[PDB]
Amino acid sequence: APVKVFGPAMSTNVARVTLCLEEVGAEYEVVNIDFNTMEHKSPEHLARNPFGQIPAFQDGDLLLWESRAISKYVLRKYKTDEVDLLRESNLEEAAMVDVWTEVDAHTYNPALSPIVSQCLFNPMMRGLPTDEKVVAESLEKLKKVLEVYEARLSKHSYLAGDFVSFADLNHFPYTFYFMATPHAALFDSYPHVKAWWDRLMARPAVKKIAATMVP
Amino acid sequence: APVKVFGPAMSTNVARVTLCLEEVGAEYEVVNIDFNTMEHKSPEHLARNPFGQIPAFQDGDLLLWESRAISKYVLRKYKTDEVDLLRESNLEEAAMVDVWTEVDAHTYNPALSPIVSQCLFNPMMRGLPTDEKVVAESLEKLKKVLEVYEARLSKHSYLAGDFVSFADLNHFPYTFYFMATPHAALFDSYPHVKAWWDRLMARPAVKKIAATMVP
Ligand SMILES: N[C@@H](CCC(=O)N[C@@H](CS)C(=O)NCC(=O)O)C(=O)O
Ligand SMILES: N[C@@H](CCC(=O)N[C@@H](CS)C(=O)NCC(=O)O)C(=O)O
Numbered sequence: 338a339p340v341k342v343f344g345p346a347m348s349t350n351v352a353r354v355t356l357c358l359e360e361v362g363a364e365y366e367v368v369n370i371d372f373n374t375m376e377h378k379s380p381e382h383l384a385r386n387p388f389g390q391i392p393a394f395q396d397g398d399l400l401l402w403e404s405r406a407i408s409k410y411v412l413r414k415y416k417t418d419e420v421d422l423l424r425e426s427n428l429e430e431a432a433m434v435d436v437w438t439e440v441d442a443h444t445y446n447p448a449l450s451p452i453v454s455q456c457l458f459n460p461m462m463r464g465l466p467t468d469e470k471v472v473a474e475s476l477e478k479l480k481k482v483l484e485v486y487e488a489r490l491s492k493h494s495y496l497a498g499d500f501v502s503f504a505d506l507n508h509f510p511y512t513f514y515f516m517a518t519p520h521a522a523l524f525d526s527y528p529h530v531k532a533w534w535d536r537l538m539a540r541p542a543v544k545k546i547a548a549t550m551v552p
Numbered sequence: 553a554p555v556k557v558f559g560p561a562m563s564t565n566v567a568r569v570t571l572c573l574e575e576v577g578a579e580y581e582v583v584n585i586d587f588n589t590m591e592h593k594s595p596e597h598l599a600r601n602p603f604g605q606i607p608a609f610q611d612g613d614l615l616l617w618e619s620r621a622i623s624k625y626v627l628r629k630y631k632t633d634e635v636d637l638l639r640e641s642n643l644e645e646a647a648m649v650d651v652w653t654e655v656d657a658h659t660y661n662p663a664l665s666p667i668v669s670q671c672l673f674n675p676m677m678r679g680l681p682t683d684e685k686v687v688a689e690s691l692e693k694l695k696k697v698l699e700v701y702e703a704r705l706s707k708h709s710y711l712a713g714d715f716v717s718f719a720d721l722n723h724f725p726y727t728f729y730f731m732a733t734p735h736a737a738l739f740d741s742y743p744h745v746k747a748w749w750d751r752l753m754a755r756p757a758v759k760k761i762a763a764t765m766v767p
Binding site: 387388399401402403405406409410413414425428429431432435436438439440442443444482485488489 | 602603614616617618620621624625628629640643644646647650651653654655657658659697700703704
């Protein structure tokens with residue numbers, strides 16, 4: 338059997354999961370879920386995710402939610418010697434995958450996402466005005482985060498060490514949409530961070546998932 | 553050598569780390585960091601965490617930050633057959649540790665923390681007024697989250713299955729402080745969730761870390 342990813346393909350936390358499936362060479366199917374008719378809150382979907390949110394995943398009789406959990410089960414399940422992206426076979430490396438995965442979720446995303454969810458995902462999706470207050474602020478916040486990212490990505494090819502990893506792939510979905518805003522040119526001031534970004538956009542798995550993220 | 557946890561012991565993300573050390577039987581030391589004199593932003597501390605936040609950890613020459621990453625490196629490092637709390641030896645079990653760990657960070661904590669950080673951690677720590685708006689709202693939000701927790705903890709002794717796990721321990725630190733507010737009696741309406749809470753408070757490792765969380 339293939340395994341099943343439930344949500345719209347456009348969606349960032351879907352793309353986390355789909356990218357991980359592409360990277361690892363997995364048979365998979367994407368089942369839409371129609372926000373506009375509350376399918377995410379429908380009882381079918383609540384049996385996948387009791388909290389009524391996308392994505393959900395099913396591998397036969399196993400039902401998972403929370404894109405990061407899904408992603409890790411996919412990364413351990415289809416692991417090869419050729420494609421170890423969580424590095425659990427090395428403790429110290431596995432730690433620096435955890436750190437930078439956690440940095441994305443707790444530092445970077447909370448400073449980047451609100452600019453995406455204001456320039457792009459507010460008028461084009463929800464038809465809601467853009468808050469210059471929240472934007473100017475997360476933009477200042479993100480310049481300082483990219484200061485730390487620059488330092489790191491000047492010492493290492495990737496966030497976790499000198500190997501692509503789950504830490505890096507996590508950063509792709511929301512950054513992809515960042516790069517569709519006027520603010521994308523921000524990375525031009527962070528040339529190490531930029532080179533690392535251009536590296537990720539060069540991978541056959543990313544080129545593919547990128548193709549799935551349009552209106 | 554022992555390993556080193558940097559921040560105040562009172563702090564929730566310190567306690568995540570310290571609890572995990574106690575559970576697993578590890579030699580460790582807690583090095584205070586004095587918020588009041590900006591030690592968390594001092595250059596010594598920035599060499600641990602470049603983002604200037606607690607906790608940080610050092611195991612000899614390894615420097616980690618982000619309590620969840622720290623916690624997992626501690627849980628893999630000191631793992632016994634007697635104390636497997638991430639269950640990486642079982643995929644399906646490891647997935648349901650990831651899910652409920654992610655639920656804490658993305659559903660539960662964001663609905664609980666703002667009541668803690670308003671009734672307790674605002675006037676007693678920052679000397680800041682309590683926002684009835686934000687409280688009433690996260691309280692309604694949390695009642696519905698505890699609906700899902702009740703369902704689950706009526707089917708299973710613990711969040712991940714019929715075994716204590718990293719998912720459960722994650723929920724301890726902020727819930728501990730929840731239980732010091734007027735709102736603690738909320739759990740009385742969620743008797744399964746309550747029994748699971750009383751179970752966690754009964755473990756020798758939790759009784760110990762609880763002792764460290766006072767003014
Ligand atoms: N932490 C989750 C994020 C889930 C999420 O962002 N949920 C959104 C996706 S657009 C949603 O379905 N929100 C609708 C709602 O809960 O009302 C993950 O890692 O997948
Ligand atoms: N996601 C982090 C949370 C870190 C955190 O909450 N930082 C606080 C701890 S009280 C802090 O030091 N804030 C000060 C600042 O960054 O200005 C973890 O898992 O440890």
